[PDB]
Structure 1
Amino acid sequence: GKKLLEAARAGRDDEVRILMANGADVNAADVVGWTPLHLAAYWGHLEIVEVLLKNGADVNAYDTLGSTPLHLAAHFGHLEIVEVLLKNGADVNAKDDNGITPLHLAANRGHLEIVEVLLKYGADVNAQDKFGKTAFDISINNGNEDLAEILQ
């Protein structure tokens, strides 16, 4: 029944559609904590996300270590997905066990568009991770002039 997990894994949007419509647990969590929304936000499939969100799949669901699907989307540069999760009520300052926000995380792998979208939905450009770095800080240290100047 929790094949939905791997449905989100391998893509196959229309089997997710068959499965969601015959009553499979939409919030089913796997051995690592990762839901089908996590999986989709990692492997970057929008439509899977839609079919999941509209059916009321938790959007602020967390795995072990407290990583949000907004975390995953924020890192991998899935700019399309991050906007849809945000419109669906995704906590922008959510923190994994290590103090990391989606803003920090996006700020670190060099996605300028996504740091913008996160700031538009009212991120905190001051949130501090466990080691006390801001998204701004991890731009100076990356030598990235652009984020730093943007993150004023």
Structure 2
Amino acid sequence: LVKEGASFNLEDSGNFLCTTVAKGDSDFLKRLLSSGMNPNSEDYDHRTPLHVAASEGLFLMAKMLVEAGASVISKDRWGNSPLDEARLCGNKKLIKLL
């Protein structure tokens, strides 16, 4: 389906991507990556998925999100950078990856 060229059509890119991040389905997320969806979508607002990634605790998918188009200084509607959540969680591996 990616060889012919016909593309996907998200119902809500930001909402779906942040819901997938919150659910923490590694297989589903990597299959979405295999589909080639842009991880720049964050939420209906600008709530960065890296915030949820730091909240959960794991680091590999946070690195995957931030390394594909995502920005480390994204400002949500509140105005909070992912550095804020990274410091709040206290986990250092995600800090190094960011």
TM category (shorter chain) comes to 0.7 to 0.9
Cα deviations across residues 41-94 of structure 1 (Å, max 9, x unaligned)? xxxxxxxxxxxxxx9652x3218xx512x2122122211211221232323121
Which residue of the partner structure matches residue 126 of structure 1?
73
TM-score by length of 1: 0.51
Cα deviations across residues 71-119 of structure 1 (Å, max 9, x unaligned)? 1221222112112212323231213233213233223221211112113
Between structure 1 and structure 2, the one with the greater Rg is: 1
Among 67, 71, 74, the alignment partner of 2:15 is 67
Q: Distance in 2 between matches of 1:132 and 1:120?
A: 22
Among 93, 96, 104, the alignment partner of 2:43 is 96
TM-score by length of 2: 0.73
CA RMSD of aligned residues (A): 2.4
Q: Distance in 1 between matches of 2:85 and 2:48?
A: 12
Q: Which runs of 5+ in 1 are unaligned?
A: 1-54
Distance 1:61 1:86, change over 3 A: farther
Given that 1:71 and 1:102 are in contact with CA atoms closer than 8 Å, whether structure 2 keeps it comes out as: yes
Q: Which runs of 5+ in 2 are unaligned?
A: 1-5
- Counterpart of 2:11, as a letter, is A
Equivalent residues in 2 for 1:1-152, closer than 5 Å: 58=9, 60-62=10-12, 67-68=15-16, 70-151=17-98
Percent identity, please. 28
